[PDB]
Amino acid sequence: NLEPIFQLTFLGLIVLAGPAVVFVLAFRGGDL
Amino acid sequence: ASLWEQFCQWVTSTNNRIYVGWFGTLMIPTLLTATTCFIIAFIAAPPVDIDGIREPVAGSLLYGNNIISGAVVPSSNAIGLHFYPIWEAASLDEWLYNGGPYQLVVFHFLIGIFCYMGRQWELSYRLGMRPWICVAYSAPVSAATAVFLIYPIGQGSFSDGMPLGISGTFNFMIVFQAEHNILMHPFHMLGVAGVFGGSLFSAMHGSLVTSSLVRETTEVESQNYGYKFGQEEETYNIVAAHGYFGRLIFQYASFNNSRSLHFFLGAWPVIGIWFTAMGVSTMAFNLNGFNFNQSILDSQGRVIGTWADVLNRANIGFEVMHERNAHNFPLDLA
Amino acid sequence: MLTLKIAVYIVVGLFISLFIFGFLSSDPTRNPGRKD
Amino acid sequence: GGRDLPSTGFAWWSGNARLINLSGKLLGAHVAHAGLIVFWAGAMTLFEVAHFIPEKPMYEQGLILLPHIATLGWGVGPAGEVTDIFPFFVVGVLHLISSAVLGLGGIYHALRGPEVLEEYSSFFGYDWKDKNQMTNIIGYHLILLGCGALLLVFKAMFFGGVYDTWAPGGGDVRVITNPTLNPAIIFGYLLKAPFGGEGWIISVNNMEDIIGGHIWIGLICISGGIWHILTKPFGWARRALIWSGEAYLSYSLGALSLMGFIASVFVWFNNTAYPSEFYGPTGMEASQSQAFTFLVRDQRLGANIASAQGPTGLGKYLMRSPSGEIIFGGETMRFWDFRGPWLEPLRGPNGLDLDKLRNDIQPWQVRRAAEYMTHAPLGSLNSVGGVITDVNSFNYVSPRAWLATSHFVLGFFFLVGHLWHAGRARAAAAGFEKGIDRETEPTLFMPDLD
Amino acid sequence: KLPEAYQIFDPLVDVLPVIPLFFLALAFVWQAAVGFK
Amino acid sequence: KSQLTYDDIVNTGLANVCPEISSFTRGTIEVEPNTKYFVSDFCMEPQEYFVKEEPVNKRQKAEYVKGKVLTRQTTSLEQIRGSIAVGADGTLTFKEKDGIDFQPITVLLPGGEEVPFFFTVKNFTGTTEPGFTSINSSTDFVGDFNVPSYRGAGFLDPKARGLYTGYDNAVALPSAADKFRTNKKETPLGKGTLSLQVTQVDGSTGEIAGIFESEQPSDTDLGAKEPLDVKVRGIFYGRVDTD
Amino acid sequence: MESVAYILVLTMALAVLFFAIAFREPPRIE
Amino acid sequence: MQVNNLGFIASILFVLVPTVFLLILFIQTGK
Amino acid sequence: MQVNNLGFIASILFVLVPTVFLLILFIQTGK
Amino acid sequence: GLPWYRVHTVVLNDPGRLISVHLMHTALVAGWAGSMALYELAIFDSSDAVLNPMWR
Amino acid sequence: MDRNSNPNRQPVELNRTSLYLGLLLVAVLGILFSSYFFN
Ligand code: CLA
Ligand code: CLA
Ligand code: CLA
Ligand code: CLA
Ligand code: CLA
Ligand SMILES: CC1=C(/C=C/C(C)=C/C=C/C(C)=C/C=C/C=C(C)/C=C/C=C(C)/C=C/C2=C(C)CCCC2(C)C)C(C)(C)CCC1
Ligand SMILES: CC1=C(/C=C/C(C)=C/C=C/C(C)=C/C=C/C=C(C)/C=C/C=C(C)/C=C/C2=C(C)CCCC2(C)C)C(C)(C)CCC1
Ligand SMILES: CCCCCCCCCCCCO[C@@H]1O[C@H](CO)[C@@H](O[C@H]2O[C@H](CO)[C@@H](O)[C@H](O)[C@H]2O)[C@H](O)[C@H]1O
Ligand code: OEX
Ligand SMILES: [Ca+2]
Ligand SMILES: [Cl-]
Ligand SMILES: [Cl-]
């Protein structure tokens, strides 16, 4: 089916969201 | 000044050969009570109807036990979790027959060990130490509380508390495995790691320190006389011990900071024991070890055995024989 | 039994009262460091 | 406030200790964590709703939040059958959205808001030594907790009532009209022995007592809130206690450990605030049910269960408790204190009544006993139900087991945390939390022990 | 289950509750990016 | 008893007490010459236990010795149903039918010997003398009752020897396994004699109360040892259905 | 009579404890 | 109980022989 | 021969206890 | 040094230690009484005071 | 109260000849009494 596929897409977007925030702050020079 | 202040100064005095303290004012009476009753009961208590089926079990030396087989027998299954002090028995003989000594000893012992842990904190405070030896002590206390209080509570009877005896301990363990598969419980696995690793690290640390002792003696006298009580100079060469160990495994796996090393020595067994205490405490609520019985099926659907199935066979063998007269109905729920 | 019950109750109450009133008796000041 | 070891004295693994004196940053951390809590509530509720088969009992489906909502009287009717799935969904949604708001506020305070609040406002600024301000915050929060208790009371009285498993005609959502304000009962609950047959407050067995105790709790909490707003700690309290942020944390940790232990016991034993309709049988209930199931079966087969002696000479099906009551035989003798709505119609003044056992047992009671016996809170860590020697085909672990185990573990580790922080708070107040000062090592001025 | 209008995002509700685990992980990620100062 | 609830009774011991009628009670229950009347909730509360100690000398009086109960308030028969049939001459015949008509009881004797026994009224048939046209203070039902083995045939001894289950030998000693007399379990059916002296009759409510004395054997532990003689003295209550 | 032997060894152990505590070698700083 | 007939003497000697060894060594120490 | 069952232990202790007393005293002499 | 048969003369002029050794002797004698009674109790046959009295 | 060294303490001695004499005495007493101990 597609339930694991959709589930994994949501999970991966979530997994990236946090590290993406940290990486953007580190690269653009925001306070950390 | 006042009589009360003088008493306070006495109880909290760091000059007493044995520190008393406020926690000590509870520890000492309860621990002495538990000890006196334990000695008397282990030597001379009459048999106890542990299973509540009028099948008394002889625990004391005078009734034919040796030291290995002797025990203070847990109170009757008929009592369950009811409070059974001496004054609730019509006679001392009745109290003994139903296992009252077990309850007396256990309750006083548990109060005493919690007060012992409080007393450790108290004395460290009086001596200006850091306060966390009692935290390390909370691991054995947690395990003791699990086996004497929490498990009987979850199971609904002090009859299911660990007996106060050697063979009784083994019986407790075997039945616990039969009913909960503690070996296949990860918290017990962590406890095993805790104790195996604690012994490993004890041996390792002791051996590295002993290996790196600074020469201060001759080959005739004990090297122990090389250390004088109250010296600041270090009695061993930690840098040589680090050189050895970092070459035994590799450099970055060896501690060179004694403080971090000793923190690790404290933390490893303590955490392992906390985890195994929590394992026993949660199997008290029958959240058991892993069950992989018939996990592997062949393509047709026949079960292929694994070592878990062999273990389950052993567990069933233990289970069907335990408390052979106590069960009336097909499922061992209680 | 009732004599035993009363006696044990008295003993336990006295020990608990000792412990409580001791820890109420300005215990934080009974240390070798600071007294504020 | 610094954000590294040289300027704070705390390593990264103790980095939150750096917040002890940054009141605004600490408020941000607290609000963000509250957001995490509310988020989990909402997300877990939505997950459970999504994974809910509304005609299969809740306890068979790994649900711990939906039973809480059902017990409150939302979405359930007689025998606990799920009428409307939408209230569960609304509770979950509301928590999720407010969690978003709480997280935003916590992030603002932790990351951009003022570092400390004391030079911005006297009302929200606090100092741990400010005994008056600390008791003010206790007072505000005591008022709020009293409001929450009265919210439960209002739901039970005027907003549809709560689920009463003891309801005549069958357990059902009913409106509590006569809560017991009688202080004798309410506060004698607190005086009952924490042992078998008494069950200190775990034994509360009727929604009237629960609601009346909550009315009392609301009044006590609100009056204590006002008391602490308008007063400062007395001399005895000032002399006995440590007055510092870590000390207050340690006190709360002790409190939390106590509450966690109590909740684990509560869910393990109590079937009133935790109806077996939603949480499944207690272990005691399941054992009693097995005894009842086989009494009924053997009686239908022709066994004279009154006079049948078992192998040991005690009655197979019936026996006496040590106080004389007529109880189920077998190992379940330990569980004779059990009371449940399916078993009490057969209990007489002396315990189990032979006449009711012989001609009053209903088919629904037989069905309930079978269900409860087969959902005994026994199970493996990988969720294989039954006794541990059973095989893999029954995927069940009681919600009571999950809740009791988790809360016992959390209670213990919070006792450990209390010990850690109480010891540290004492040592820091006395000024030796960083080690023994070599110059003034206290033991060196102490006489030798012998 | 979820009421009918919402079962397009069933696979998102399936993963929502584990998010606080990721926050706990993110604390360590942030500390790793700052070199665990 | 009285008129309270299980909540008032629980953990008091009252559940083990046989109900009592009254004080101003000297009634009588008239009985038809040849009809049988059901007895509804017959209760027997033991109070005194004596064990006939066995002297080693010979030929000498054994002297029943008072024992003390180690089991708790678990010693009473109750909810017993039976019947009373009135003979052709006038005799009264009490017949126990069922109920909670047995309790295992263990008494301690001076000297530390523990005596379990199966205190019961099972299948008790008792009779009065002829010429009874009523149940009154002179009604003495003297009769017999059966005493099943204390341990059932499903019991396993500590070496898992039993009658219809378990080993028939001492497996822990393979070369002496068949050497032990206790390898053979028995459950003989013993005999007891009971007497129910009616002392107080409330004929309106049908309640009779009185004293009882019973004589029976003790546990033999599956025939391991010889049965002692246990005498039990106590009180009894019941309701006689007149209609 | 083996009970006497068990009691003897247990008493010996406890007596050793009491002396090791009460009559210990003082730790001395020098 | 029918115990091993050498039990008491074995136990007594097992304890007594090392006890007296230690006692001798301790008492003569400092000579 | 059916001898007194305490004979061996009594004989052993009767000899051993004073033997060890003398041995202790002798060995520590000069301390 | 002292011959063996004279060791106890060390408390001859030490009233405190003379009291001490008298106390220890009294403790030993009282402990013997207690333990002897306990032993006799552990083996006493009380059933037949006629043909098996205590002095038998 | 203080713990003061007791000045009444004296060494005890058993010379080698005394050792041999005592050991012989003990051995011959054992020889004598063992037969009666066994009976
Ligand atoms: C306990 C939680 C808490 C506490 C103590 C504070 C405290 C503070 N906040 Mg903050 N905040 C929070 C949560 C909290 N906040 C949350 C969850 C958000 C996201 C919406 C914010 C977003 C926020 C912003 C953007 C700002 C603050 C500011 C402030 C400071 C000024 C307060 C003020 O005078 O405004 C006035 C107070 C009022 C007008 C009272 C209104 C009360 C609320 C909003 C109405 C609802 C009341 C409710 C019924 C009570 C119970 C709540 C219920 C959920 C149980 C102050 C120290 C300001 C600041 O730092 O100044 C420099 C500021 O810039 N906060
Ligand atoms: C979370 C809520 C909360 C918190 C943190 C506090 C905190 C405090 N209160 Mg309190 N209080 C509250 C709610 C709260 N209160 C409510 C709702 C009321 C209304 C009834 C009160 C009414 C009140 C009064 C009248 C007083 C306080 C006082 C105090 C201060 C010292 C009291 C103390 O030492 O504690 C611990 C208690 C003791 C050290 C006394 C010993 C108590 C017994 C011996 C403990 C035994 C408990 C037992 C083991 C547990 C079993 C459970 C149950 C069976 C009892 C302290 C800062 C005192 C103060 O400083 O006044 C301003 C004070 O006199 N409060
Ligand atoms: C409300 C509860 C509470 C609060 C507010 C605090 C707050 C604090 N604690 Mg504390 N503590 C608590 C409970 C609490 N603690 C409990 C219950 C324990 C017993 C275990 C402790 C034991 C403790 C110790 C030993 C120390 C503190 C310290 C501190 C200070 C810094 C800690 C820090 O930076 O965290 C940083 C966070 C981490 C390093 C991550 C820890 C991860 C844990 C170990 C595992 C998480 C397991 C969890 C169940 C999830 C499982 C994951 C699974 C999926 C694999 C801080 C003020 C420090 C201190 O004393 O400061 C002065 C310190 O040394 N605490
Ligand atoms: C009180 C807390 C609690 C309880 C009682 C439950 C109970 C349950 N959950 Mg749940 N959950 C929780 C919190 C809880 N959860 C949290 C915080 C999350 C967010 C991650 C979730 C997300 C979640 C999902 C997605 C699912 C569940 C499911 C379930 C059910 C199956 C349980 C299972 O097999 O897990 C397995 C057991 C383990 C994996 C063992 C966990 C052991 C931890 C690591 C113990 C930590 C030890 C200690 C605290 C370490 C710190 C100490 C330190 C000092 C060293 C069950 C009723 C399942 C279900 O059936 O849904 C309907 C399901 O699919 N939960
Ligand atoms: C109250 C009774 C009593 C007391 C207090 C004393 C006290 C003393 N006697 Mg003396 N004595 C007594 C009765 C007593 N005696 C009797 C009844 C006899 C005749 C047998 C003697 C004959 C005697 C002699 C010849 C000498 C003494 C000496 C001494 C002094 C040193 C003792 C010593 O160190 O030996 C230590 C003894 C040992 C190290 C081992 C002795 C082992 C014995 C033989 C067996 C022990 C068996 C058992 C433990 C004792 C139970 C017996 C009990 C029921 C009485 C001391 C002041 C000596 C002296 O005068 O010093 C200057 C000395 O030479 N006594
Ligand atoms: C500060 C800090 C931190 C913390 C943080 C936190 C703690 C947080 C949080 C937060 C939060 C707490 C959040 C949140 C959120 C939420 C959201 C964002 C939401 C939403 C929504 C939605 C979108 C929904 C939707 C839906 C609906 C409507 C219903 C149906 C289903 C669904 C799901 C679809 C850390 C540690 C990192 C570190 C650094 C510092
Ligand atoms: C709702 C409810 C109810 C009710 C309840 C109530 C009413 C309650 C309460 C309660 C309370 C009212 C409580 C309490 C508590 C207390 C505590 C918990 C305490 C304490 C203590 C402490 C902690 C102290 C300490 C100390 C000491 C000891 C001394 C020194 C100082 C110090 C401080 C350290 C009922 C059951 C009916 C039903 C159910 C529901
Ligand atoms: C497959 C290959 C192996 C995979 C390896 C995965 C594990 C690797 C280590 C995980 C990362 C640890 O992260 C490591 O933390 C240390 C703390 O000592 C920090 O160390 C670094 O900090 C900062 C980076 O901002 C630098 O200025 C500094 O000079 C450097 O020491 C870094 O944050 C990173 O180097
Ligand atoms: O008691 Mn001792 O162990 Ca706990 O599981 Mn049910 O009960 Mn009895 O049978 Mn298996
Ligand atoms: Ca889904
Ligand atoms: Cl067993
Ligand atoms: Cl059973």
Side-chain angles (χ1 to χ4, degrees), chain F residues 206-219:
Chain F
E207 314 168 65
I208 70 146
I211 281 278
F212 81 79
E213 176 189 344
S214 69
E215 197 354 80
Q216 63 159 285
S218 66
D219 190 13

Side-chain angles (χ1 to χ4, degrees), chain D residues 21-191:
Chain D
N21 294 316
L22 298 181
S23 44
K25 288 247 199 253
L26 199 41
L27 171 67
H30 282 99
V31 173
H33 174 277
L36 289 182
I37 303 190
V38 184
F39 180 98
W40 178 87
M44 203 65 266
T45 315
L46 296 165
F47 186 87
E48 284 187 353
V49 164
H51 296 240
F52 185 31
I53 295 148
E55 39 267 87
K56 170 182 262 258
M58 281 190 199
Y59 55 86
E60 275 193 352
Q61 320 184 39
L63 313 175
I64 56 177
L65 299 197
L66 296 209
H68 286 94
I69 305 174
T71 300
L72 284 165
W74 269 312
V76 289
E81 62 72 19
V82 180
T83 48
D84 193 3
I85 200 65
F86 191 65
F88 305 112
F89 182 68
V90 159
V91 175
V93 164
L94 288 192
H95 288 77
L96 195 44
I97 301 306
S98 323
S99 96
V101 166
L102 285 181
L104 176 291
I107 287 183
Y108 159 72
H109 274 299
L111 291 187
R112 207 201 136 70
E115 191 106 315
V116 303
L117 308 170
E118 291 69 43
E119 65 216 59
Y120 158 76
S121 49
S122 60
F123 185 75
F124 295 107
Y126 63 84
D127 173 52
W128 300 118
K129 297 279 186 325
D130 194 0
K131 309 222 190 33
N132 176 264
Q133 176 79 317
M134 295 319 83
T135 55
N136 280 334
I137 294 151
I138 295 181
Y140 310 148
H141 298 180
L142 282 180
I143 289 160
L144 275 173
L145 275 286
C147 281
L150 296 183
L151 268 200
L152 170 59
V153 167
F154 172 87
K155 172 62 175 88
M157 299 220 203
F158 317 109
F159 199 48
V162 298
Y163 190 89
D164 177 25
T165 200
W166 300 99
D172 177 33
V173 175
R174 92 176 154 92
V175 162
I176 316 301
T177 68
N178 192 276
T180 165
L181 290 325
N182 179 324
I185 314 136
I186 303 302
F187 308 91
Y189 269 114
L190 327 167
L191 281 195

Side-chain angles (χ1 to χ4, degrees), chain D residues 20 128 145-146 220 273 280 286 307 344-345 372 380 424 428 449:
Chain D
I20 288 170
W128 300 118
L145 275 286
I220 286 145
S307 319
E344 301 315 291
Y372 282 173
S380 74
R424 198 178 193 282
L449 288 176

